């Protein structure tokens, strides 16, 4: 119709203008969500443990110059700030312990183990968490498209074999994707404090590409060598005490120690249609320089201005819809004016009229932690999102009277305020600037509420307790954290064998426990590792090839039990399934139905004649194999004898129901008149 | 009748997608130029 | 994005004609109508003609309170739309410009102004 | 079988606060399979209007983003997420159910609140 196909057309064009829109908006903007975060901070392991605890207080600066390395002491302090080879301020955190690592477990020769920079055995060690806190098995994860996109920097060496030695501090370790398994892109880069911020933006252009699905973002350092702490004092601009002051009175800018951090960023869509967790929403980031300034290591405000600028006009938003901003501290005496000046200038200027912008800094209570700090910063950001609470730590007192602190809507983070949801839907910023002049912008927000659920289980309903994988870790000793990993306070079910990330393929060794009561973990499974059990299946798996063939058997004759269960006939609905359609099937020929027999329900004929004897077991074989490749064990070689034939037979589909059963039954019925 | 209404507005939609689909080319296949070149090579090389 | 040449205007002094006209590039002729608008100073615009032209149809389609008064006129083939406006009128002074359709006026342009009064 | 047209004739604005504008006729502009047949001007002081947004939400090339149309049956919404000051000029709803279609009439202006 030429009234119609012009309609058609009209339609169609319609549809894919809306659709090259929506496309186009996608390209230039998305939401990528963050689904799992893990670290390893000087003192203690990662999330709550060492945050919103010890945040909410504070604390730190233990000093204690680390005596597990070599760093000859008594040396390296003195209080002339002018000798040599000498610097002052013992003071400074550090790991607790950087040499452990685990070696077999990754697969790698102690010879090779023993020459290997400790930043890459942190970083396995952080990766593997972090995969493991987001609820994907690790196993999983082989064969796709993630990239690791990190920022790393060498520090120190060993100044004391036809290999390694120069590929262990080789800086570009990109070897997680080899342990793994990946094939995104994998990228070391280097751009001094401000590292890891870059490195996100460089991810965040993949994931709006379609070149990479997940992306990890993160960095470490070690501290090796005594190194920075002498050079910099031979600076004087190390100050004693270390404990740094942002936007005080004291002017230390201290270099902190070691810090590993890591997170894993995905596109918010594939996020909600897989059926992740999301916990926070990054939408907008800039980077630039700061030209020529007045020295090769000195801040520029305008520069500053104009990036804050562009990631407010990238992310399409306005300067008075962000509720609190972390600021790059680095304590000092001419930086922190300058970042305050900025950030008045720029977020000032008539912000709400009440609302004011409470500011802070991560690096006041935990250290400057080198590069590794600015993805430091987002560790605190989110979780203020996650207990409506702003961890304000900041410890100092009196402002910088060198900046006009009043007559503004800047407010600096004295105590703590409250966070809570609702209504203005909560946004946040971090930046950083690097020592080389590269200065870096982020906005994050609130991710959506959906969170709904049901409540089920607490019936009888056995449930399996496959062990928390037991694996190629030593093939004993692990087995203890896994009996004792599992105390359950107040709790039930918790499925780790499910498709949870704790799967880890249980790789060797596996064990199992069935019940519904109670954990009877602690029990002999707990010490299996040193003893014995009771009635729990302990395996010593080598798993020679993971997917074995199957075959199943089928011979009787001899079975002739009591009456084959009858709690699975009810429990198990396959089972009932298919013995009704088995009676279905050999009722309009015998008059015997064999679910009243398996019941014993009054009126069941005795267990004696083999008229009734043969066929009900036939009945019950066939209903197991359903069971059995209801689990997915998919038999192929049946080899059952006998009076099985006939039901291997079925089950390997020679035969249909009917015909079995007819045949059963005049067999049975025939040899009835043969006896004694 | 009513296909002059049809073919214009037809057209107006054939114009605004060929816009669309031109944007989307430059901000995923743009091509780049490269202007001058230097290096430093063993030997006398230069330029 | 420059076929918007619009141009002509005077004094005319009342019964006279004049020759306005507009040129177009860009674009093609054949399959689009021309249409006319002309603005009262200090009131509303409206169509000068209720033009609906060229194309395949090829019609005049003269608006209402003009009986061939403004001379439908519109030369088609020759990259222009001149329209005569012989036997003028001390009421019609304003500023008549052009259109790149028919029902969608999307594209317009610079228009002319024409006073005829002393 | 005339629809006429209105709109609130006033709304003095102030940069950053959104915008809208409502638009009603007399009888359905709906067709045979919806798209109603409204379109929307703009004309700047001292040039000549342009187009903004045609058959309800279709907003054209070369328009900014802010301006959005919305609406069916016999009403219509025409709203603006930023307002600017580059932006006064005067507004106009036009059908196309018609043909014989004359002058817009009053339309709508847009001013600076003050």
């Known amino acids: 119709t030429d009234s119609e196909k012009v309609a058609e057309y009209l339609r169609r064009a319609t549809l894919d203008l809306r659709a090259a829109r929506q496309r186009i908006r996608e390209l230039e903007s998305d939401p990528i969500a963050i689904v799992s975060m893990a670290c390893r901070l000087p003192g203690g392991v990662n999330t709550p443990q060492r945050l919103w605890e010890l945040l909410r207080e504070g604390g730190e600066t233990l000093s204690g110059f680390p005596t597990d390395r070599g760093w000859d002491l008594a040396r390296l302090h003195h209080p002339d700030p002018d000798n040599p080879g000498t610097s002052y301020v013992d003071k400074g955190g550090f790991l607790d312990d950087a040499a452990g690592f685990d070696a077999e477990f990754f697969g790698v020769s102690p010879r090779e183990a023993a020459a290997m920079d400790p930043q890459q055995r942190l970083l396995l060690e952080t990766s593997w968490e972090l995969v493991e806190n987001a609820g994907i098995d690790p196993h999983s994860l082989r064969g796709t498209a993630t990239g690791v996109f990190l920022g790393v920097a060498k520090f120190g060496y060993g100044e004391d074999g036809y290999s390694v030695t120069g590929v262990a501090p080789a800086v570009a370790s990109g070897r997680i994707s080899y342990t793994m398994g990946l094939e995104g892109p994998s990228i070391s880069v280097d751009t001094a404090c401000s590292s890891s911020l870059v490195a996100l933006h460089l991810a965040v252009e993949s994931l709006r590409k379609g070149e990479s699905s997940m992306a990890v973002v993160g960095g470490a350092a070690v501290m090796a060598t005594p190194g920075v702490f002498v050079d910099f004092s031979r600076q004087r601009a190390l100050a004693a005490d270390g404990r740094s002051k942002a936007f005080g009175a004291g002017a230390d800018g201290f270099g902190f120690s070691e810090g590993v951090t890591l997170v894993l960023l995905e596109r918010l869509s594939e996020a909600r249609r897989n059926g992740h967790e999301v916990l926070a929403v990054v939408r907008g980031s800039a980077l630039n320089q700061d030209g020529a300034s007045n020295g090769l290591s000195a801040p520029s405000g305008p520069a500053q201005r104009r990036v804050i600028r562009q990631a407010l006009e990238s992310c399409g938003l306005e300067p008075g819809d962000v509720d609190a901003v972390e600021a790059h501290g680095t304590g000092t005496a001419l930086g922190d004016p300058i970042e305050a000046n900025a950030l008045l200038d720029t977020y000032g200027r008539d912000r709400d009229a009440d609302r004011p912008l409470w500011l802070g800094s991560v690096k006041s209570n935990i250290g400057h932690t080198q590069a590794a700090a600015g993805v430091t910063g987002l560790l605190k950001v989110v979780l203020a999102l996650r207990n409506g609470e702003l961890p304000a730590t900041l410890h100092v007192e009196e402002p910088t009277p060198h900046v006009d602190w009043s007559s503004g809507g800047v407010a600096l983070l004295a105590g703590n305020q409250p966070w809570r949801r609702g209504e203005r839907t909560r946004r946040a910023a971090v930046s950083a600037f690097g020592i080389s002049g590269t200065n870096a912008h982020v906005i994050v927000e609130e991710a959506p509420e959906r969170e709904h659920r049901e409540t089920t289980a607490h019936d009888g309903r056995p449930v399996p307790l496959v062990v928390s994988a037991r694996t190629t870790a030593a093939l004993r000793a692990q087995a203890a954290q896994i009996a004792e990993l599992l105390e359950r306070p107040d709790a039930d079910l918790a499925g780790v064998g499910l498709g949870l990330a704790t799967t880890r393929a249980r790789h060797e060794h596996r064990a199992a426990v069935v019940a519904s009561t109670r954990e009877e973990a602690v029990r002999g499974l707990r010490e299996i590792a040193a003893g014995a059990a009771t009635a729990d299946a302990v395996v010593e798996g080598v798993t020679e090839v993971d997917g074995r063939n199957v075959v199943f058997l089928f011979p009787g004759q001899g079975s002739q039990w009591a009456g084959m269960g009858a709690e699975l006939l009810s429990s198990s609905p396959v089972f009932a399934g298919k013995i009704r359609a088995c009676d279905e099937s050999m009722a309009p020929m015998q008059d015997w139905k064999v679910s009243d027999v398996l019941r014993q329900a009054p009126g069941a004929p005795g267990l004696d004649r083999v008229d009734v004897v043969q066929p009900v077991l036939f009945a019950v074989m066939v209903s197991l194999a359903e069971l059995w490749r209801s689990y997915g064990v998919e038999p192929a070689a049946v080899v059952g004898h006998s009076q099985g034939e006939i039901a291997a037979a079925h089950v390997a589909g020679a035969l249909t129901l009917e015909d079995a059963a007819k045949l059963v039954v005049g067999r049975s019925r025939l040899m009835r008149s043969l006896s004694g | 009748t009513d296909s002059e209404k049809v073919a214009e507005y037809l057209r107006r939609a054939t114009l605004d997608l060929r816009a669309a689909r031109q944007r989307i080319r430059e901000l995923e296949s743009d091509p780049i130029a490269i202007v001058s070149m230097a290096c430093r090579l063993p030997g006398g090389v230069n330029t | 994005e420059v076929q918007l040449v619009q141009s002509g205007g005077g004094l005319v002094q009342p019964g006279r004609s004049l020759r306005l006209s507009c040129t177009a590039s860009?674009?093609?002729?054949?399959?689009?109508?021309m249409s006319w608008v002309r603005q009262a100073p200090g009131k509303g615009l409206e169509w000068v003609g209720f033009?609906?032209?060229?194309?395949?149809?090829?019609?005049?389609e003269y608006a209402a309170s003009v009986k061939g008064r403004f001379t439908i006129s519109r030369d088609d083939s020759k990259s222009i739309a001149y329209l005569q406006m012989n036997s003028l009128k001390t009421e019609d002074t304003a500023v008549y410009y052009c259109?790149?359709?028919?029902?969608?006026?999307?594209?317009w342009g610079q228009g002319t102004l024409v006073t005829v009064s002393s | 079988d005339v629809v006429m047209t209105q709109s609130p004739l006033s709304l003095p604005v102030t940069p950053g606060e959104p915008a809208s504008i409502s638009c009603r006729s007399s009888?359905?502009?709906?067709?045979?399979?919806?798209?109603?047949?409204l379109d929307w001007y703009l004309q700047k002081p001292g040039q000549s209007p342009q187009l903004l947004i045609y058959l309800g939400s279709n907003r054209a090339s070369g328009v900014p983003d802010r301006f959005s149309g919305s609406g069916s049956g016999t009403d219509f919404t025409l709203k603006i997420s930023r307002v600017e000051a580059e932006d006064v000029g005067v507004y106009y709803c036009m059908q196309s159910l018609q043909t014989p279609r004359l002058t817009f009439g009053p339309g709508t202006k847009v001013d600076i609140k003050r």
């Open positions: 009888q359905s502009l709906l067709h045979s399979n919806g798209y109603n047949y």
């Open positions: 860009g674009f093609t002729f054949g399959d689009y109508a």
């Open positions: 259109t790149r359709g028919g029902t969608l006026f999307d594209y």
């Open positions: 033009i609906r032209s060229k194309a395949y149809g090829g019609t005049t």
